[PDB]
PDB file of C-alpha atoms and ligand atoms in Angstrom:
ATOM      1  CA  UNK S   1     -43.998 -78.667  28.794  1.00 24.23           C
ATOM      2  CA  UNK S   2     -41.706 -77.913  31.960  1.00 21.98           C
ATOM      3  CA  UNK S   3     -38.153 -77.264  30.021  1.00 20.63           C
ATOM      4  CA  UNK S   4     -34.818 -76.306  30.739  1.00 21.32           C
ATOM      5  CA  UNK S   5     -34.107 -72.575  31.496  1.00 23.27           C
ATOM      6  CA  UNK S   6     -30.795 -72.556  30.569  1.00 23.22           C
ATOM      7  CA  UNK S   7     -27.703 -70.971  30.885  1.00 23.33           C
ATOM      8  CA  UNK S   8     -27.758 -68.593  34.528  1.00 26.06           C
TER       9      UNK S   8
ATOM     10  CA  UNK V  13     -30.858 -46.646  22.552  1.00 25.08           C
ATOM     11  CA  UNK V  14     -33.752 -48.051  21.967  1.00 25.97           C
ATOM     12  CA  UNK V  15     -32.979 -51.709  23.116  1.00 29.02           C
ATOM     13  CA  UNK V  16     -34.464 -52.253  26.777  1.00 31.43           C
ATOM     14  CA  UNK V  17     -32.167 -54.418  29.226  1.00 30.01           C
ATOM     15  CA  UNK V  18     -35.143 -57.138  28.609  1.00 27.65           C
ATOM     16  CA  UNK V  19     -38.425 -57.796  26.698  1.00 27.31           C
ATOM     17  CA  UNK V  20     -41.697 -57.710  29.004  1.00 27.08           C
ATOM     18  CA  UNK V  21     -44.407 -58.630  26.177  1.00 26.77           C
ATOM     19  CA  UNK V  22     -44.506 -61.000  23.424  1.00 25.80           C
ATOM     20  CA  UNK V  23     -44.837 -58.332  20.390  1.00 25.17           C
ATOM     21  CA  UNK V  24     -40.654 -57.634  21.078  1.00 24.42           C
ATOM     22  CA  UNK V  25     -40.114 -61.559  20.462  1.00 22.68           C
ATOM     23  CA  UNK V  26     -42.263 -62.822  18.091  1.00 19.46           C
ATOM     24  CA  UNK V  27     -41.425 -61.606  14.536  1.00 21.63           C
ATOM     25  CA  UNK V  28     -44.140 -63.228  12.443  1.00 27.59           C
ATOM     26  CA  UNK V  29     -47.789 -64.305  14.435  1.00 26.99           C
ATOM     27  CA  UNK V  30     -48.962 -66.555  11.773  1.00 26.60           C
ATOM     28  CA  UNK V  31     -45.538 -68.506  11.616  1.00 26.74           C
ATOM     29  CA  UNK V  32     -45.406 -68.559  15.604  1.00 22.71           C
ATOM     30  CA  UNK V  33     -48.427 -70.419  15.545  1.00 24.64           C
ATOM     31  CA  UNK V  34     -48.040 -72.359  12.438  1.00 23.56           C
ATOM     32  CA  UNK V  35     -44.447 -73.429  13.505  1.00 19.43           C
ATOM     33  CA  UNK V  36     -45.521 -74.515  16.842  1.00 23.79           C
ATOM     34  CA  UNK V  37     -48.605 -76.703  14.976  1.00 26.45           C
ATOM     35  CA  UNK V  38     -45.910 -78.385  13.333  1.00 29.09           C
ATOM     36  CA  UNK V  39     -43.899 -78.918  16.071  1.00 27.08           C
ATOM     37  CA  UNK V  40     -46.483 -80.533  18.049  1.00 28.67           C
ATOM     38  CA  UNK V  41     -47.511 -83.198  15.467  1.00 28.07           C
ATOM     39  CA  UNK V  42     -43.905 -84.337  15.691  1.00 27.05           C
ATOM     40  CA  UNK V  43     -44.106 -85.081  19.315  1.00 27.78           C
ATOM     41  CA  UNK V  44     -44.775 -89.425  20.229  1.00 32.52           C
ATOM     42  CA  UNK V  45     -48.452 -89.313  22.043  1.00 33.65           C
ATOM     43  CA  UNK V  46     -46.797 -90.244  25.676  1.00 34.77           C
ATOM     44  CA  UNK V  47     -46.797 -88.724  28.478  1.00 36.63           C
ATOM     45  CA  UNK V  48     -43.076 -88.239  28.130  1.00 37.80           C
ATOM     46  CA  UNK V  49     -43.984 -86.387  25.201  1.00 37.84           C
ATOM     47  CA  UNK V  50     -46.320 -84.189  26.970  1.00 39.30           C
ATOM     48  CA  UNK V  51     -44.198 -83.300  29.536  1.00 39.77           C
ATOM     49  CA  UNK V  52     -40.767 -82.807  27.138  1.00 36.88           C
ATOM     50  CA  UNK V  53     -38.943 -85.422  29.001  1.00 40.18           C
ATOM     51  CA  UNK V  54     -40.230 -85.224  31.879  1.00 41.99           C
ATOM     52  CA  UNK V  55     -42.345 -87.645  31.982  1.00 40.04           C
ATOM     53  CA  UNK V  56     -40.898 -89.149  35.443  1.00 40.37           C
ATOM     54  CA  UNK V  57     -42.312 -86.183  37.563  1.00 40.89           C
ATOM     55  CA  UNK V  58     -46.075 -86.211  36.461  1.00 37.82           C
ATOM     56  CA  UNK V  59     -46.752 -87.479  39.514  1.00 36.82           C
ATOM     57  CA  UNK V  60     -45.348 -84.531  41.762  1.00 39.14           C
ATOM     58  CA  UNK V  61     -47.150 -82.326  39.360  1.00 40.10           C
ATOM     59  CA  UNK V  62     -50.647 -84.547  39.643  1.00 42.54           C
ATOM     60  CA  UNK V  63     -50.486 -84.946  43.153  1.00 43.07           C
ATOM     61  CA  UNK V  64     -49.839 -81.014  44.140  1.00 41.07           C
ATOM     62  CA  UNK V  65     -52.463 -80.172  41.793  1.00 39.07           C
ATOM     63  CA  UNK V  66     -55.122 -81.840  43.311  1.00 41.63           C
ATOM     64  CA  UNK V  67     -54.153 -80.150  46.513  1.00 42.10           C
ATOM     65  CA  UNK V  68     -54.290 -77.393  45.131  1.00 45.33           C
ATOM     66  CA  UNK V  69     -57.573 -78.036  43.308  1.00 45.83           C
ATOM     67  CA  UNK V  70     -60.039 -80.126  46.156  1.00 45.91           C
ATOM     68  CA  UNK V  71     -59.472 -76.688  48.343  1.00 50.92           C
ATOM     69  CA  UNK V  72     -62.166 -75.080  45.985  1.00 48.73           C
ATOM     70  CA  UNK V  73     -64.004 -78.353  46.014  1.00 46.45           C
ATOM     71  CA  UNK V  74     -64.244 -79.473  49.322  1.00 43.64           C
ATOM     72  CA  UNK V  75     -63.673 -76.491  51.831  1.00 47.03           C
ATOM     73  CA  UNK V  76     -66.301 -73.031  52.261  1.00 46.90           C
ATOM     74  CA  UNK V  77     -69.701 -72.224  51.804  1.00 45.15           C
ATOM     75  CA  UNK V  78     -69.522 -71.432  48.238  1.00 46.49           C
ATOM     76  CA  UNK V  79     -68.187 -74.505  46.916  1.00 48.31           C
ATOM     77  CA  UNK V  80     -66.388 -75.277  43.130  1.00 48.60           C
ATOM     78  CA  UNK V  81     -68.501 -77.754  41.538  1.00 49.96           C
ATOM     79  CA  UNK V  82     -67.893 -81.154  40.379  1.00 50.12           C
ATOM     80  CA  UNK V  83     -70.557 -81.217  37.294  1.00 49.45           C
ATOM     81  CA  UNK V  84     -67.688 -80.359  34.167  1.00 48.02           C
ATOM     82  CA  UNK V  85     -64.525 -79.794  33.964  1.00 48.03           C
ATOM     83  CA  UNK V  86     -62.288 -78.041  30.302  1.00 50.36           C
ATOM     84  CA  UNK V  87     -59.146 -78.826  29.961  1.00 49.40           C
ATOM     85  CA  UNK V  88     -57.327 -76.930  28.056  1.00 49.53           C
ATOM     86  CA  UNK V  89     -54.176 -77.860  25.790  1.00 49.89           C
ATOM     87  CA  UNK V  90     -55.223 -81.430  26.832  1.00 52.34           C
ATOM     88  CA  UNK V  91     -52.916 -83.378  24.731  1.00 51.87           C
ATOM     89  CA  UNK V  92     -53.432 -86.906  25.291  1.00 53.80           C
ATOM     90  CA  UNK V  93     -55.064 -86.909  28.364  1.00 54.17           C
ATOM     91  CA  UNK V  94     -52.895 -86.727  30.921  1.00 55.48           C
ATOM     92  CA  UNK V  95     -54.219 -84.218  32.905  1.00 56.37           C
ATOM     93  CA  UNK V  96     -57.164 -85.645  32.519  1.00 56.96           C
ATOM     94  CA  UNK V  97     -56.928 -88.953  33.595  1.00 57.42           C
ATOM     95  CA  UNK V  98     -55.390 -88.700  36.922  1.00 59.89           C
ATOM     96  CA  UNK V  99     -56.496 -85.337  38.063  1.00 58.83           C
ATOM     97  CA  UNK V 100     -59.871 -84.073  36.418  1.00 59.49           C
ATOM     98  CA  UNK V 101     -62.183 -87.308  35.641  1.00 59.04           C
ATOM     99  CA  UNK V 102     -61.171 -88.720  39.069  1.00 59.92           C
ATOM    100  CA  UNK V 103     -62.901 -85.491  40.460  1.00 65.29           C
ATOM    101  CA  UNK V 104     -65.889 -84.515  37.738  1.00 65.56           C
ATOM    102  CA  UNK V 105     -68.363 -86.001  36.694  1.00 63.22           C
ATOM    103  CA  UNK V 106     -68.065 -84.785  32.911  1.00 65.77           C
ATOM    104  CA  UNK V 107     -64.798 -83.789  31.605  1.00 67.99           C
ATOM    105  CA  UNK V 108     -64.333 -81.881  27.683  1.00 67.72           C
ATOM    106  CA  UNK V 109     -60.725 -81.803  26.198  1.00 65.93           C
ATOM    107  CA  UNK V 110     -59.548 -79.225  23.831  1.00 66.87           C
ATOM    108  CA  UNK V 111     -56.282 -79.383  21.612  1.00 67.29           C
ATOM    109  CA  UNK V 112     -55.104 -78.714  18.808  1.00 65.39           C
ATOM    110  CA  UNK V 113     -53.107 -82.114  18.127  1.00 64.73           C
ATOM    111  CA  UNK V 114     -55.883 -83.876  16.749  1.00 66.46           C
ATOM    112  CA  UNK V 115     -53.833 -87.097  16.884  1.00 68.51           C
ATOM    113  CA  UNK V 116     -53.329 -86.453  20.656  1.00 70.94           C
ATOM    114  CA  UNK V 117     -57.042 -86.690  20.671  1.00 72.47           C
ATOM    115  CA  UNK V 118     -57.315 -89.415  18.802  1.00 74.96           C
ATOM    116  CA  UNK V 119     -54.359 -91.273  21.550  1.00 74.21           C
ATOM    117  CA  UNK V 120     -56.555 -89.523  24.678  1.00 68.80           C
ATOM    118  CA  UNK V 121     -59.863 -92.443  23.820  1.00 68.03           C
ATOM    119  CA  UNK V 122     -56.940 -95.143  24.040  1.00 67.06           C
ATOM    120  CA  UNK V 123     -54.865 -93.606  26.954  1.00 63.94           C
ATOM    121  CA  UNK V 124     -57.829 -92.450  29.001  1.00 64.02           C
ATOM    122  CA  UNK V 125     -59.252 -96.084  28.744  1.00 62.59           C
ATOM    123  CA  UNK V 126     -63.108 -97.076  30.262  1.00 59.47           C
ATOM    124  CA  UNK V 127     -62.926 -93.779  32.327  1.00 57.10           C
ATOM    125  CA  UNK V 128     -62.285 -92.163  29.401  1.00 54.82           C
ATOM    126  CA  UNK V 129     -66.353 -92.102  28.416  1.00 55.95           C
ATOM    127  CA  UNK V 130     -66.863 -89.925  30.422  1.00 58.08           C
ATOM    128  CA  UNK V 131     -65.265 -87.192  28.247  1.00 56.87           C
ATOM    129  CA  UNK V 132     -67.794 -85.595  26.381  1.00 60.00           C
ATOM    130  CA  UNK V 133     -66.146 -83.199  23.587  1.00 60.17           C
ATOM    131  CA  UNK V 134     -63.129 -83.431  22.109  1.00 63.68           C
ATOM    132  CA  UNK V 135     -62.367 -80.455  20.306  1.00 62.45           C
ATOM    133  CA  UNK V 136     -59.564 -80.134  18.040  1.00 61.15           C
ATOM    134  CA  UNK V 137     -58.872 -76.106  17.864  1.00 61.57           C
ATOM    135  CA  UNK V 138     -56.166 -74.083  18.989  1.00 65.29           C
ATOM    136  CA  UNK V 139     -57.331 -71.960  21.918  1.00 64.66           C
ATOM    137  CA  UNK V 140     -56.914 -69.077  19.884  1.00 63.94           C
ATOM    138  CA  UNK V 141     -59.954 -69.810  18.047  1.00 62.68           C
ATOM    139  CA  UNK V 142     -62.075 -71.059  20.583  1.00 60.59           C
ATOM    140  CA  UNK V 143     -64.975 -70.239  22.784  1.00 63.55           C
ATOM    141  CA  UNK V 144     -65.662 -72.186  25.518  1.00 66.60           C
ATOM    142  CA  UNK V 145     -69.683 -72.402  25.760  1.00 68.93           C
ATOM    143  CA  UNK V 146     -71.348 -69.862  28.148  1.00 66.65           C
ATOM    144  CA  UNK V 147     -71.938 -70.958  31.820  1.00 68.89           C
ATOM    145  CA  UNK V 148     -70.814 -73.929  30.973  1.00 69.20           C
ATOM    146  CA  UNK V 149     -67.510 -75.481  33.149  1.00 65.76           C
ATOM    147  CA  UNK V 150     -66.940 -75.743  37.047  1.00 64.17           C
ATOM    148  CA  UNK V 151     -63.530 -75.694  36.219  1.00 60.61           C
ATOM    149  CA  UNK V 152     -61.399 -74.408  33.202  1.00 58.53           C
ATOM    150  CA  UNK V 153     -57.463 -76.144  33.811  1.00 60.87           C
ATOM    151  CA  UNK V 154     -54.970 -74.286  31.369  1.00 61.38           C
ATOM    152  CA  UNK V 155     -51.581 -76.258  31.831  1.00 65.54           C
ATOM    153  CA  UNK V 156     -48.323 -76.155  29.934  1.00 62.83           C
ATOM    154  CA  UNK V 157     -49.682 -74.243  27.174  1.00 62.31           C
ATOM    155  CA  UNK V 158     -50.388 -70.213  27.728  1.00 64.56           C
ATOM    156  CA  UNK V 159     -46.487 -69.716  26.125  1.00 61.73           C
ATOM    157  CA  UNK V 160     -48.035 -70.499  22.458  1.00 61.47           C
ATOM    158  CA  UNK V 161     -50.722 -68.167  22.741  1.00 59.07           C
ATOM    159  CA  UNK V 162     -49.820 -64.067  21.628  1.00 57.63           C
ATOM    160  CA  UNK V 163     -50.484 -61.611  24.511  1.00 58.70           C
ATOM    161  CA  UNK V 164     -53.676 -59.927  22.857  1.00 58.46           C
ATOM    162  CA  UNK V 165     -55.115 -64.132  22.254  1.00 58.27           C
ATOM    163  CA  UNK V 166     -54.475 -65.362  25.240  1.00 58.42           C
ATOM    164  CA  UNK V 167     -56.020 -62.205  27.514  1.00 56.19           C
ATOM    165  CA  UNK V 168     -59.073 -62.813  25.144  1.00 54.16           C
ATOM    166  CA  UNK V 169     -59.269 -66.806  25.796  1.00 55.45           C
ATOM    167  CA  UNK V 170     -58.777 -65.678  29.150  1.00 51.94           C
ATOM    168  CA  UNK V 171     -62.257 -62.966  29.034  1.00 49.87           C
ATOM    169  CA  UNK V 172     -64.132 -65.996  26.959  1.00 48.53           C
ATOM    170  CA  UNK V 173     -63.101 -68.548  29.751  1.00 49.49           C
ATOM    171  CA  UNK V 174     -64.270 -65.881  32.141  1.00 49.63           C
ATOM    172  CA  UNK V 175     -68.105 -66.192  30.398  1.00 48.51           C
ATOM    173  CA  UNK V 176     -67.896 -69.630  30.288  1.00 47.30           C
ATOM    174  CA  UNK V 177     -67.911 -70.449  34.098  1.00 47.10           C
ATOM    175  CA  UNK V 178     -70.696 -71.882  36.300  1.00 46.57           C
ATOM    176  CA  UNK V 179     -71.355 -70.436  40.208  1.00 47.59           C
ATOM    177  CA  UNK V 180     -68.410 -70.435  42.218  1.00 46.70           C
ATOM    178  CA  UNK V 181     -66.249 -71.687  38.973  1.00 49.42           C
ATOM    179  CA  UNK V 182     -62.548 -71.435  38.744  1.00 49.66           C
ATOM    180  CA  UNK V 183     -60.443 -71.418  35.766  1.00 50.77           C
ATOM    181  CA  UNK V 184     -56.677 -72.441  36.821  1.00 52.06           C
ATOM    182  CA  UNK V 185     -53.703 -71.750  35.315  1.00 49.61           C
ATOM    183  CA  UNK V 186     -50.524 -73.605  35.744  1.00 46.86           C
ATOM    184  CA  UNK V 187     -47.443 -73.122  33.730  1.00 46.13           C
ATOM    185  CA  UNK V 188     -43.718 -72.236  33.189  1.00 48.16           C
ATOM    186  CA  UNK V 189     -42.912 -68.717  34.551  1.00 48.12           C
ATOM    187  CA  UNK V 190     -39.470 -67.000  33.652  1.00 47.41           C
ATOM    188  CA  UNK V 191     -37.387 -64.927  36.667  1.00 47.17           C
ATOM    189  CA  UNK V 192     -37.900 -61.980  34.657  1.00 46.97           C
ATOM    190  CA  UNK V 193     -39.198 -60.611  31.576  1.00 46.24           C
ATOM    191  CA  UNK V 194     -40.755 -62.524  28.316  1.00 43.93           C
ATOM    192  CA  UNK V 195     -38.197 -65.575  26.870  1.00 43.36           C
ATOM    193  CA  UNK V 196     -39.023 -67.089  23.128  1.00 42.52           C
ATOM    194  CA  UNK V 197     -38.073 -70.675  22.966  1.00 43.24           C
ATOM    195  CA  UNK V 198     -37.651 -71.017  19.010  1.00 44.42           C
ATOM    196  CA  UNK V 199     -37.840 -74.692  19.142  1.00 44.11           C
ATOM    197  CA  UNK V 200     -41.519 -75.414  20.073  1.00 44.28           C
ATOM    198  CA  UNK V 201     -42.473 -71.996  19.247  1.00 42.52           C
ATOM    199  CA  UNK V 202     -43.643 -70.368  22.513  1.00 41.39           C
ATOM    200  CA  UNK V 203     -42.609 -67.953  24.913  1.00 40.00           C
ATOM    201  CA  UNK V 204     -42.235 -67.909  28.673  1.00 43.11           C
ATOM    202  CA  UNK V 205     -43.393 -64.726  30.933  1.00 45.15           C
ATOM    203  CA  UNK V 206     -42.834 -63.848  33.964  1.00 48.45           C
ATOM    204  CA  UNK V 207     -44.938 -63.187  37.029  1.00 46.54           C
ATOM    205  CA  UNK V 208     -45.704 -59.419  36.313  1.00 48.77           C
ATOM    206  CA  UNK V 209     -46.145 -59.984  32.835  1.00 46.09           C
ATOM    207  CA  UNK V 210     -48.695 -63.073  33.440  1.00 44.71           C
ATOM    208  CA  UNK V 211     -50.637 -60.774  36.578  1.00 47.27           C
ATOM    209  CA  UNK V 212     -51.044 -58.110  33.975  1.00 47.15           C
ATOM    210  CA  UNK V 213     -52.830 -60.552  31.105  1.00 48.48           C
ATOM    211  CA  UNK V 214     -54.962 -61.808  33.810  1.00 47.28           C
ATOM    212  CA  UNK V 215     -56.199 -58.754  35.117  1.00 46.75           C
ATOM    213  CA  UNK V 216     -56.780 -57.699  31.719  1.00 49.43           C
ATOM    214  CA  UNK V 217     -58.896 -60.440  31.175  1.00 53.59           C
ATOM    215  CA  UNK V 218     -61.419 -59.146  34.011  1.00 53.50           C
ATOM    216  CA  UNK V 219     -59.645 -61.914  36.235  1.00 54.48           C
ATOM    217  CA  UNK V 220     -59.328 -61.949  40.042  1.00 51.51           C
ATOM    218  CA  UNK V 221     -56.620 -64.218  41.595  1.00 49.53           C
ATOM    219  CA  UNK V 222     -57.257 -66.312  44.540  1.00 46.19           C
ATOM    220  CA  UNK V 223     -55.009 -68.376  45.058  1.00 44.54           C
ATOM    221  CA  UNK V 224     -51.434 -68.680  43.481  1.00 42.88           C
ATOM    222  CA  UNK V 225     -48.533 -70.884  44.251  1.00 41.91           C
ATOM    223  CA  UNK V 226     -45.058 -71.990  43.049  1.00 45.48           C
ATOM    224  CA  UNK V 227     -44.983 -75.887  42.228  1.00 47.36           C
ATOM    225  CA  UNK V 228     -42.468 -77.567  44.906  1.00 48.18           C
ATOM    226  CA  UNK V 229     -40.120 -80.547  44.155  1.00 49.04           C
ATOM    227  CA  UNK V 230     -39.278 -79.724  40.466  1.00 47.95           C
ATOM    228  CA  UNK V 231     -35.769 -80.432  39.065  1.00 48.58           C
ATOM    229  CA  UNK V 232     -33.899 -78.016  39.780  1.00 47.94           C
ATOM    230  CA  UNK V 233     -32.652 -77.036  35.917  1.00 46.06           C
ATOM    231  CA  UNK V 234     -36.113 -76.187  34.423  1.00 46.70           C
ATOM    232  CA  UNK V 235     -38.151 -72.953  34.633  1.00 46.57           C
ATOM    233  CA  UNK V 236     -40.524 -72.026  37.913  1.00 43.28           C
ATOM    234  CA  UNK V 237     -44.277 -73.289  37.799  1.00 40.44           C
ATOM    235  CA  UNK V 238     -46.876 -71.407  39.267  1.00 42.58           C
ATOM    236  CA  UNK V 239     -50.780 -72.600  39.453  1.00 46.20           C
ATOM    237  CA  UNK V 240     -53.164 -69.378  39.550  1.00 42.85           C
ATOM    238  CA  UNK V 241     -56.777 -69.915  40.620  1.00 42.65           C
ATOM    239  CA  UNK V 242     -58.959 -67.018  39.123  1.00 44.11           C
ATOM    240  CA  UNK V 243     -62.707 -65.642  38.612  1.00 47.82           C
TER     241      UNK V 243
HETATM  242  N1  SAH N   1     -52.499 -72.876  20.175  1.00 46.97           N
HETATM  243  C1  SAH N   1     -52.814 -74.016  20.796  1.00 46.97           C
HETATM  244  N2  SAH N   1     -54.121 -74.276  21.133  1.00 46.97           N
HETATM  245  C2  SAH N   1     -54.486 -75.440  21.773  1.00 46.97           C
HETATM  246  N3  SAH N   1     -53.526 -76.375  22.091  1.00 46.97           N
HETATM  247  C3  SAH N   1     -52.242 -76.129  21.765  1.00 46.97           C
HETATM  248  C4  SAH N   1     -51.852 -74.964  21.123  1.00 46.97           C
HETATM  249  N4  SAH N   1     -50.511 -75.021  20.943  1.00 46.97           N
HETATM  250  C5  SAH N   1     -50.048 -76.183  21.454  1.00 46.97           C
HETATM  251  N5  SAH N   1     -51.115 -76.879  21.958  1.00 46.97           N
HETATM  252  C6  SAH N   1     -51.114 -78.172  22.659  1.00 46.97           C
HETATM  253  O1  SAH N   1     -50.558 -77.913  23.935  1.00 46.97           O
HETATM  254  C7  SAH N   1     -50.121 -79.138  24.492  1.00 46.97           C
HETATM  255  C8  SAH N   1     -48.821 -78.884  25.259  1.00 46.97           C
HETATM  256  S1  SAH N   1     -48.104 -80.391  25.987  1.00 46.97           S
HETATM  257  C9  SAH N   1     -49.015 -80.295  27.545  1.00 46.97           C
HETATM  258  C10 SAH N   1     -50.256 -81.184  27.561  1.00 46.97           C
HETATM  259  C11 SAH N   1     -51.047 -81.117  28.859  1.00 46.97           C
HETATM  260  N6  SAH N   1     -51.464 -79.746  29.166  1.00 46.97           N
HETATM  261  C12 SAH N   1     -50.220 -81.718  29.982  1.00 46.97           C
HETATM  262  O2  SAH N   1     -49.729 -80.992  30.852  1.00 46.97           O
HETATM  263  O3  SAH N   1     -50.055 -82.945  30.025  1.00 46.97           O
HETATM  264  C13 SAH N   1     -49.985 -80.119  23.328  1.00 46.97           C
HETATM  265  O4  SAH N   1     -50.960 -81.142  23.458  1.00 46.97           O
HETATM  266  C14 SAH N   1     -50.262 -79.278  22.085  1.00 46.97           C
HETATM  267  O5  SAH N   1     -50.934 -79.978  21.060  1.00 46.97           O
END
């Protein structure tokens, strides 16, 4: 699914 | 040293194949059949995904003298339809699902509803292990699922996908790409590649790209989504 990348 | 600034492949992040896959098989069957489900809480932008994939789609369908056709349609990773019901059967004739959720299956007869007879095979195998029949599909759609394939399965799929298109057929890929390099999400069990990394399984999959573009109007914390046409 589409998800968070995270942290920059 | 030998550690790189960055993985670019997904034999420096997976440890163990056959518990990458099995993991991720077990993850999947613990998901609720929804479309929120599908779409890991996202359920409330399927429609901004839908709607600028069949743009992106009816170009091949309805524009130049060597038309996609509208006979059958794969799609692959199906889940419980979703894909399916508001892009592909609205647009082909005959539509075949693969998964390998059989329960998502089993949800896609109820979710897809009266329109739903016109899906023809259901098959319940991980792409992995299967072939898609020879000349075969006017379209092959791959969404939201290349991350749980290895590098070395999923430029295979790719070549068998390849064998399995009619005239003038496309097989599309659409998925989460990473800025750079290869990321393993240990949760679900899957990785996400970047754009090199993706161009390079493609092309090693006898592939040629003709059209590919980044998915507008997506929140803003989640990875990039690119849709690739290829032949
Ligand atoms: N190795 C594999 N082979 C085939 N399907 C797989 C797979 N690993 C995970 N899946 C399936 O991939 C799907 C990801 S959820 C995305 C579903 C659909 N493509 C959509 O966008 O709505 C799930 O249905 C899951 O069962």
């Amino acid at each position: 699914x589409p998800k968070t990348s995270g942290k920059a | 040293g030998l550690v790189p600034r960055g993985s670019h492949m997904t034999s420096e992040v997976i440890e163990d194949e056959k518990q990458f896959y099995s993991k991720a098989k077990t993850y999947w069957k613990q998901i609720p059949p929804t479309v929120d489900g599908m779409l890991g809480g996202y359920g409330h932008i399927s429609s901004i995904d839908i709607n600028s994939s069949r743009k992106f789609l009816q170009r091949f369908l309805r524009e130049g003298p060597n038309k996609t056709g509208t006979s059958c349609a794969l799609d692959c990773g199906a889940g419980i339809g979703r894909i399916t019901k508001r892009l592909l059967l609205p647009l082909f004739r005959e539509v075949d699902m693969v998964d390998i959720t059989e329960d998502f299956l089993v949800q896609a007869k109820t979710y897809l509803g009266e329109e739903g007879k016109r899906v023809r095979n259901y098959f319940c195998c991980g792409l992995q292990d299967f072939t898609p029949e020879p000349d075969s599909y006017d379209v092959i759609w791959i969404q939201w699922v290349i991350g749980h394939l290895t590098d070395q399965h999923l430029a295979e799929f790719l070549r068998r996908c390849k064998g399995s298109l009619r005239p003038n057929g496309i097989i599309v890929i659409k998925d989460n790409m990473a800025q750079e390099g290869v990321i393993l999400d240990d949760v679900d069990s899957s990785v996400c590649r970047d754009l090199d990394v993706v161009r390079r399984i493609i092309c090693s999959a006898g592939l040629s790209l003709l059209a590919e573009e980044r998915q507008e109007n997506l929140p803003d914390e989640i990875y990039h989504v690119y849709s690739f046409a290829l032949r």
